[PDB]
Write an enzyme that holds these catalytic residues in place. Structure first.
Site, PDB file in Angstrom:
ATOM      1  N   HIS A  67       0.834  -1.200   0.000  1.00  0.00           N
ATOM      2  CA  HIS A  67       0.000   0.000   0.000  1.00  0.00           C
ATOM      3  C   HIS A  67       0.871   1.253   0.000  1.00  0.00           C
ATOM      4  O   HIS A  67       0.418   2.316  -0.386  1.00  0.00           O
ATOM      5  CB  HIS A  67      -0.999   0.020   1.171  1.00  0.00           C
ATOM      6  CG  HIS A  67      -0.396   0.414   2.476  1.00  0.00           C
ATOM      7  ND1 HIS A  67      -0.082  -0.509   3.453  1.00  0.00           N
ATOM      8  CD2 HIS A  67      -0.083   1.629   2.982  1.00  0.00           C
ATOM      9  CE1 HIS A  67       0.425   0.127   4.494  1.00  0.00           C
ATOM     10  NE2 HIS A  67       0.426   1.424   4.239  1.00  0.00           N
TER      11      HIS A  67
ATOM     12  N   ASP B 218      -0.612  -7.432   1.601  1.00  0.00           N
ATOM     13  CA  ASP B 218       0.028  -6.128   1.704  1.00  0.00           C
ATOM     14  C   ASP B 218       1.536  -6.305   1.869  1.00  0.00           C
ATOM     15  O   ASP B 218       2.096  -6.181   2.963  1.00  0.00           O
ATOM     16  CB  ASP B 218      -0.570  -5.309   2.842  1.00  0.00           C
ATOM     17  CG  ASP B 218      -0.174  -3.834   2.772  1.00  0.00           C
ATOM     18  OD1 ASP B 218       0.362  -3.420   1.701  1.00  0.00           O
ATOM     19  OD2 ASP B 218      -0.425  -3.122   3.779  1.00  0.00           O
TER      20      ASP B 218
ATOM     21  N   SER C  45       3.863   2.546   8.721  1.00  0.00           N
ATOM     22  CA  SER C  45       3.398   1.445   7.896  1.00  0.00           C
ATOM     23  C   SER C  45       4.457   1.110   6.834  1.00  0.00           C
ATOM     24  O   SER C  45       5.192   1.977   6.354  1.00  0.00           O
ATOM     25  CB  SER C  45       1.988   1.693   7.350  1.00  0.00           C
ATOM     26  OG  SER C  45       2.005   2.642   6.336  1.00  0.00           O
ATOM     27  N   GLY C  46       4.556  -0.171   6.525  1.00  0.00           N
ATOM     28  CA  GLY C  46       5.621  -0.705   5.704  1.00  0.00           C
ATOM     29  C   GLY C  46       6.823  -1.149   6.488  1.00  0.00           C
ATOM     30  O   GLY C  46       7.636  -1.924   5.965  1.00  0.00           O
TER      31      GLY C  46
HETATM   32  O1  LIG Z   1      -7.842   5.391   7.076  1.00  0.00           O
HETATM   33  C1  LIG Z   1      -6.698   5.124   7.438  1.00  0.00           C
HETATM   34  C2  LIG Z   1      -5.563   6.093   7.544  1.00  0.00           C
HETATM   35  C3  LIG Z   1      -4.343   5.187   7.664  1.00  0.00           C
HETATM   36  C4  LIG Z   1      -4.934   3.804   7.773  1.00  0.00           C
HETATM   37  O2  LIG Z   1      -4.313   2.731   7.846  1.00  0.00           O
HETATM   38  N1  LIG Z   1      -6.305   3.881   7.885  1.00  0.00           N
HETATM   39  C5  LIG Z   1      -7.159   2.680   7.709  1.00  0.00           C
HETATM   40  C6  LIG Z   1      -7.212   2.047   6.334  1.00  0.00           C
HETATM   41  C7  LIG Z   1      -8.219   0.907   6.429  1.00  0.00           C
HETATM   42  N2  LIG Z   1      -8.486   0.177   5.173  1.00  0.00           N
HETATM   43  C8  LIG Z   1      -8.893   1.052   4.035  1.00  0.00           C
HETATM   44  C9  LIG Z   1     -10.026   2.030   4.355  1.00  0.00           C
HETATM   45  O3  LIG Z   1     -11.222   1.295   4.591  1.00  0.00           O
HETATM   46  C10 LIG Z   1      -9.524  -0.848   5.441  1.00  0.00           C
HETATM   47  C11 LIG Z   1      -8.797  -2.112   5.871  1.00  0.00           C
HETATM   48  C12 LIG Z   1      -7.488  -2.051   5.116  1.00  0.00           C
HETATM   49  C13 LIG Z   1      -7.274  -0.585   4.801  1.00  0.00           C
HETATM   50  C14 LIG Z   1      -3.610   5.663   8.929  1.00  0.00           C
HETATM   51  C15 LIG Z   1      -2.656   4.637   9.486  1.00  0.00           C
HETATM   52  C16 LIG Z   1      -2.933   3.840  10.650  1.00  0.00           C
HETATM   53  C17 LIG Z   1      -1.797   3.097  10.795  1.00  0.00           C
HETATM   54  C18 LIG Z   1      -1.552   2.086  11.717  1.00  0.00           C
HETATM   55  C19 LIG Z   1      -2.115   1.948  12.971  1.00  0.00           C
HETATM   56  C20 LIG Z   1      -1.669   0.781  13.588  1.00  0.00           C
HETATM   57  C21 LIG Z   1      -0.835   0.098  12.740  1.00  0.00           C
HETATM   58 CL1  LIG Z   1      -0.036  -1.480  13.071  1.00  0.00          CL
HETATM   59  S1  LIG Z   1      -0.490   0.821  11.235  1.00  0.00           S
HETATM   60  O4  LIG Z   1      -0.929   3.339   9.805  1.00  0.00           O
HETATM   61  N3  LIG Z   1      -1.462   4.348   8.999  1.00  0.00           N
HETATM   62  N4  LIG Z   1      -4.713   6.143   9.792  1.00  0.00           N
HETATM   63  C22 LIG Z   1      -4.253   7.126  10.785  1.00  0.00           C
HETATM   64  C23 LIG Z   1      -4.340   8.494  10.106  1.00  0.00           C
HETATM   65  C24 LIG Z   1      -5.107   8.288   8.805  1.00  0.00           C
HETATM   66  C25 LIG Z   1      -5.620   6.850   8.865  1.00  0.00           C
END
Ligand SMILES: O=C1[C@@H]2[C@H](C(=O)N1CCC[N+]1(CCO)CCCC1)[C@H](c1cc(-c3ccc(Cl)s3)on1)N1CCC[C@@H]21
Ligand code: NA
Ligand code: NA
Lengths: 54, 233
Positions: free
Chosen positions: B42, B88, B185-186
């Site tokens: 991603h 992923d 992430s990653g």
């Molecule tokens: O919406 C967000 C973004 C991003 C993220 O993953 N989310 C969730 C994505 C969720 N999915 C897509 C949207 O439906 C659904 C399941 C897979 C991705 C981001 C985020 C959250 C994280 C993590 C939290 C804990 C982790 Cl281990 S990685 O890493 N990046 N969130 C914090 C700020 C914005 C929001």
């Protein structure tokens, strides 16, 4: 003897055979003569923190 | 990383940072070898172009040991799905090889069956990165790490608003305010076994960061050990 007790005495990977365990190691290590320890082949083996400043 | 601690010198040497059109970090990676970095698929959609930095602990200080590498080839999993973040995982081949040194060393890839019986059954793993220090906060200028408990799959599924596939696992805490976050992430999830650190996960996603009743979601590297080997030739 079993991998479920002290990982078969192996430093890294353990697998069970009929009666015995066999140890092995990741790339960048050689299994020691004792069949248990894993000896790095270089100064930056995988998975080791870099604490001995060279 | 929310909570946790700053990585001590030499203690997170497999951390890589993907840097966008600005030398700003937006995702992590894990050093696998002189030529290969492990990251999340991603992350590939989150910057038009990017490079990889290794050896950094403080993004506001030129220590001397940092290096930047260009990407020669991106190897994305062909089943990666943006909607669900299933599969992923990606590997990056670098144009020039990493020189291992202080703060720059690979994490080990474990054998699959032993990883399942011995690593995934540990109480905890370690996650690290330069990501946000709270959900709505800013990215850390210092590399942080955090011990995260493994969370059982049934609990994982019940807690989540989104499908948890068998290519994913949960780690972290129900209510304790510690987690990975955006910008991590990653990056690496590693598990210690007798002072050797093995790759067990890739930071993938979460619903917020450190929210009560939510966990961190990680790519289950055991499902991809053969895929990683093939991708690295
Ligand atoms: O919406 C967000 C973004 C991003 C993220 O993953 N989310 C969730 C994505 C969720 N999915 C897509 C949207 O439906 C659904 C399941 C897979 C991705 C981001 C985020 C959250 C994280 C993590 C939290 C804990 C982790 Cl281990 S990685 O890493 N990046 N969130 C914090 C700020 C914005 C929001
Ligand atoms: Na720096
Ligand atoms: Na939580």
């Amino acid at each position: 003897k079993l991998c479920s007790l002290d990982n078969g005495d192996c430093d890294q990977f353990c697998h069970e055979e009929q009666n015995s365990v066999v140890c092995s190691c990741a790339r960048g290590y050689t299994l020691a003569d004792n069949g248990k320890a894993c000896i790095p082949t270089g100064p930056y083996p995988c998975g080791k923190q870099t604490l001995e400043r060279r | 990383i929310v909570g946790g601690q700053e990585c001590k010198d030499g203690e997170c040497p497999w951390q890589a940072l993907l840097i966008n059109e600005e030398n700003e970090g937006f995702c992590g990676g894990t050093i696998l070898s002189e030529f290969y970095i492990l990251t999340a698929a991603h992350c590939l959609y989150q910057a038009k172009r990017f490079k990889v930095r290794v050896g950094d602990r403080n993004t506001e200080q030129e220590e001397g040991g940092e290096a930047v590498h260009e990407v020669e080839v991106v190897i994305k999993h062909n089943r990666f799905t943006k909607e669900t973040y299933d599969f992923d995982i990606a590997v990056l081949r670098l144009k020039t090889p990493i020189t291992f040194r202080m703060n720059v060393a690979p994490a080990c890839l474990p054998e699959r069956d032993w990883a399942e019986s011995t690593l995934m059954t540990q109480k905890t793993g370690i996650v690290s990165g330069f990501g946000r220090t709270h959900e709505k906060g800013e990215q850390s200028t210092r590399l942080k790490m955090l011990e995260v408990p493994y969370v059982d799959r049934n609990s994982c599924k019940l807690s989540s608003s989104f499908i948890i596939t068998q290519n994913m696992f949960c780690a972290g805490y129900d209510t304790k305010q510690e987690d990975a976050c955006q910008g991590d992430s990653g990056g690496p999830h590693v598990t210690r076994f007798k002072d050797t650190y093995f790759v067990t996960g890739i930071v993938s996603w979460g619903e917020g960061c450190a929210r009560k009743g939510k966990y961190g979601i990680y790519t289950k590297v055991t499902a991809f050990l053969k895929w990683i080997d093939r991708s690295m030739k």
